């Protein structure tokens, strides 16, 4: 039965490349819109979970929070043209001695002017957004699902927003404070999401739907791990194997912490892709349902593109075309199926369950 499938969203952090995920979701949302006769119908309408790790959770915000009308804030072909507008001046180079190569005051600013005072309790979907707390040193994860057991769980949609970007070395760790049930105040000491290893959060998304399942009937087809009865579109924003822009053993000898310090996190970006895009394929593949998984990566960045933090006009402009030359490539070697087609398919099943919902 389609009608009692759960369906996830679920997006990779990387920066500015987040400009690639983003062009996948005009085209899965502009499909949307063509076959529903609904040129207001948004990503949230369709899917039960939407995830996101630093750019990946800035999108996640910008599509699940509420307007004055109680709609998505923006619409998918809105995100491109944020990134163009806003990216260079998010990635402005603060020239500060000491510190983060960005003061992050631009991207709390448009993050607070996009979002107001909206809470996360707000959010038109379930929102899974990642971040790691330096001083509990443990992952916080902002959802609605948790905040019956934990209301100080509660923060600001922008204090989120910026916390699960905040990538040490590149912007400052965030501070903020939110109240428990008997009043107390509750602190979090954020940094990006990427440090809680789930740079690519699809696992962590599927997971919170799971736990969901145990008390939301709207999830029940799911428990018993059933993942035949889950359809889940999982978005990169590329990774890079070509030798002109990986290392040796051999050079990497003589490395000092700096060295180590602005390469690590690429590293470890690309290898949650890996790990997560494993873990879910052995999953769906037990079950055999590998088409209920889609997995859109680009796995050939070439030359600018491989920067988290280049807003060049250029740059931005060659993102743009990854993700376009993305949706006509094949979903895998010997399958040529393109991306297109494959998110044409994933548009038709989102459309036909929440038809059949509404019966």
């Given at each position: ?17 987040g ?17 529903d ?23 996640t ?57 909206t ?35 509660d ?9 699960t ?11 903020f ?26 696992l962590?998304?599927?997971?919170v739907?799971?736990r ?11 428990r018993?791990?059933n ?36 390469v ?8 949650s892709?890996?790990?997560?895009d ?10 055999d ?59 038709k ?7 059949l919902?509404?019966?």
């Open positions: 039965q389609l009608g009692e499938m759960v369906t996830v969203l679920s997006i990779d952090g990387g920066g500015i490349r400009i690639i995920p983003a062009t996948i979701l005009e085209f899965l949302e502009g499909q949307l819109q063509e076959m006769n609904n040129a207001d119908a948004r990503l949230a309408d369709y899917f039960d979970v939407i995830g996101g790790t630093s750019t990946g959770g800035l999108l915000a910008m599509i699940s929070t509420p307007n004055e009308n109680n709609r998505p804030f923006a619409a998918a072909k809105e995100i491109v043209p944020f990134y163009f507008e806003h990216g260079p001046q998010i990635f402005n180079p603060s020239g500060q001695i000491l510190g983060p190569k960005y003061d992050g005051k631009y991207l709390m600013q448009v993050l607070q002017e996009k979002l107001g005072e809470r996360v309790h707000q959010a038109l979907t379930e929102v899974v957004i990642s971040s790691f707390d330096i001083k509990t040193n443990k992952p916080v994860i902002f959802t609605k699902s948790n905040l019956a057991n934990s209301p100080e769980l923060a600001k949609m922008y204090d989120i927003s910026y916390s970007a905040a990538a040490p070395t590149y912007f400052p760790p965030h501070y404070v939110t109240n428990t049930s008997n009043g107390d105040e509750y602190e979090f000491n954020l940094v990006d999401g990427a440090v809680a290893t789930v740079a690519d959060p699809a962590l998304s599927i997971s739907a799971t969901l399942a145990q008390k939301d009937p709207a999830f029940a087809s799911i018993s791990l993942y035949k009865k889950m359809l889940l579109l999982s978005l990169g924003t590329g990774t890079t194997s070509e030798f002109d822009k990986t290392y040796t053993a051999k050079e990497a000898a003589t490395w000092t912490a700096v060295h180590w310090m602005l690590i996190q690429k590293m470890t970006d690309a290898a892709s890996y790990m997560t494993y873990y879910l394929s052995t999953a769906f593949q037990a079950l349902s590998k088409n209920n998984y889609l997995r859109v990566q680009e796995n050939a960045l070439t030359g600018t593109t491989t920067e988290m933090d280049d807003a060049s006009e250029a740059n931005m402009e060659l993102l743009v075309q990854v993700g376009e030359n993305l949706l006509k490539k094949p979903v895998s070697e010997d399958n040529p199926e393109t991306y297109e087609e494959a998110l044409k398919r994933f548009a099943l989102l459309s036909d369950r929440k038809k919902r509404a019966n």
